[PDB]
Every structure is written in structure tokens, then in C-alpha cells.
Amino acid sequence: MNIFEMLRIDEGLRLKIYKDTEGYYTIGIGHAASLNAAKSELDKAIGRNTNGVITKDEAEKLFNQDVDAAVRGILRNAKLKPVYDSLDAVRRAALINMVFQMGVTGVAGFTNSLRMLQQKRWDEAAVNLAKSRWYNQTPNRAKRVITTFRTGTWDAYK
Ligand SMILES: [Cl-]
Ligand SMILES: [Cl-]
């Protein structure tokens, strides 16, 4: 398992623009954004007039771009970079997963959890991570991500 397979599980795959529960237009593997504005962003991202329908290959390329953006966001952030560097490969994926979902600023706001992860106090980190609005909003996913941070294994995704 790697970050790509993990996020694919958490984000699913859609080949036609869809409006999620919070009102955002989304497509591909968690590529989120009016509809005209959404299609404009998508067309620029894909490189053609898609009219809202794309191929699996295009979804994967977009996904690859979005994952790269999350990784670079972590590395360019003073609070997240040190934590990421200190983590093993599996826990690093959980951090990328969080950034992919909520953005760099959002994850950087998890002060207690970040400090605990840096100190390898996995259970303390898990306790703090669950005490969040993020967790309460998308709990099934948060539980998988937290279990990953806690154990350093892919158990929650198998
Ligand atoms: Cl926190
Ligand atoms: Cl919060």
C-alpha cells in the first residue's frame, strides 16, 4: 500500500462532475472545486473542453497532481515539515491524506496532535485527533486515518 491507494479508497472515483454533500463540485479522485466555474477549473486542469466528463487516465493524472500539491504544501509549511520528516512512511501517508482532504492550514492547526506525532506518542496523538470537528464531520475516514497514525500500519485499509 501507498498514499495513492490509500486516498483512492478514501476519495473514491467519479468520472463525471458531481456535487457533494457540502455543495462543492467534485470529480475524479477527490478533485474538488457555480458549475460553470467548476468546469472552467476542470478544463484548465485537464487541458481540454471536458464538458464535465473525463477518462480514468485523466482522473489519475489529476489525482497525481493533487497528491503532489499536498506533499509540497507540507514541505513548504514550517509546522508540518518537521513532523513529516520525523515520521515513518506509513504515518507520512496519513499526514498527506489529511492535507489532501482539508488543506495545509487545516492540518497545521492540529498543534497537540502534531507535537505528539513528532514525539512518537501515537496514542496521545490519536486521542487528540479524534477530539476535532474534522473527525466529527467525516468520522469513518478520520477513524481510518487515526488508526494509521496510531499503529503505523495499513490495517485500517485492508
Ligand atoms: Cl490537535
Ligand atoms: Cl477543531
Swiss-Prot record:
The protein's location, in the record's own words, is:
Host cytoplasm
| Substitution effect: S113I | 500-fold decrease in enzymatic activity
The species this protein belongs to is: Enterobacteria phage T4 (Bacteriophage T4)
The annotated consequence of T26H reads: Facilitates transglycosylation more effectively than hydrolysis; covalently bound substrate
Name assigned to this protein:
Endolysin
- Family in the record: Belongs to the glycosyl hydrolase 24 family.
The organism that produces this protein has a lineage beginning with: Viruses, Duplodnaviria, Heunggongvirae, Uroviricota, Caudoviricetes
Q: Provide the effect of D20 to E/Q.
A: Loss of 99% of enzymatic activity
Keyword Metal-binding set for record: no
Concerning CDD domains, the annotation shows:
T4-like_lys (cd00735)
Which reaction does this chain catalyze? Answer: Hydrolysis of (1->4)-beta-linkages between N-acetylmuramic acid and N-acetyl-D-glucosamine residues in a peptidoglycan and between N-acetyl-D-glucosamine residues in chitodextrins
Describe how expression is induced or repressed: Expressed late in the viral replication.
Q: What is the effect of changing E11N?
A: Loss of 84% of enzymatic activity
Q: Which UniProt keywords apply?
A: Antimicrobial, Bacteriolytic enzyme, Cytolysis, Glycosidase, Host cell lysis by virus, Host cytoplasm, Hydrolase, Viral release from host cell
